[model samples]
Target: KVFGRCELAAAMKRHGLDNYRGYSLGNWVCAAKFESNFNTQATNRNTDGSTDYGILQINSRWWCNDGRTPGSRNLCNIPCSALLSSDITASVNCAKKIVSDGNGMNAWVAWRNRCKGTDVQAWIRGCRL
Candidate 1:
């Protein structure tokens, strides 16, 4: 799985997805509530009883069999798990792409008015490990 702060930060910059971490984290917390309910090992069941697995609620069978679904061609490449290994990165990146190639302007646009502390929110929220 994606691990550590330096590693995660490097990933963010490499992908051109930096800053807006505040908006990212908020969206992640929200999505985590919906996707896998924050259970890293949770999986949804198909009508046939097949399973879609993992924290991000990825379908490993459809996604790739590489433990975290990171090996999957489609699902793995996009999640916050792929970026920061948490819901924040997961949901934020999707917002990022839609807004500005996963850089996070959309989330900023979504909450900049209400979440005034976004620039300094990390000191309050810290980066989720």
Candidate 2:
């Protein structure tokens, strides 16, 4: 798992997510905080039976395969486990694809519930960037 805000920012930057689709780096950092606490392998089972995968918690309902669920869009053409890797390259790329679809960060439930309309700048506080 990533250690803290600094490590998370570095990883995100290294994976080319420093900035994209007009969203600030803070937005990304805050989303990660509420989504998975920077743990890449984090997963959550929703009441709907779909799972949220990886740091971004990309949903199995639309983004990835969880091996049992069928009819997934798999728009990123990746398995849910791929997003669980510490590398996070695939997850970041897939997140960009989601954003590119005009959803912005709204695709993530955490973004809507916690990160949105909040003061997220602290997510990057004390980070070198």
* Model 1, global lDDT: 0.41
Best by TM-score: 2
Q: State the RMSD for candidate 1.
A: 8.8
Model 1, residue 11: C-alpha shift (Å): 14
lDDT tens digits, residue span 43-85, model 2: 8888777889988899897888877665678888898998989
Q: Which pairs of residues collide in model 2?
A: none
- Put down candidate 1 lDDT per residue, 1-129, tens digits, no spaces: 423433443444444444444344334333333455555555565564334544334444333243443334443354323423443345334444444435443323323443344443242245533
Angstrom error of the Cα, residue 115, model 1: value is 16
Assess every candidate by TM-score: 0.35, 0.91
Per-residue lDDT, model 1, residue 41, is 51
Error of 2 at 36 (Å): 0.7
Task: State the lDDT at 107 in candidate 1.
Answer: 27
Candidate 2, poorest ten consecutive residues by summed lDDT: 64-73
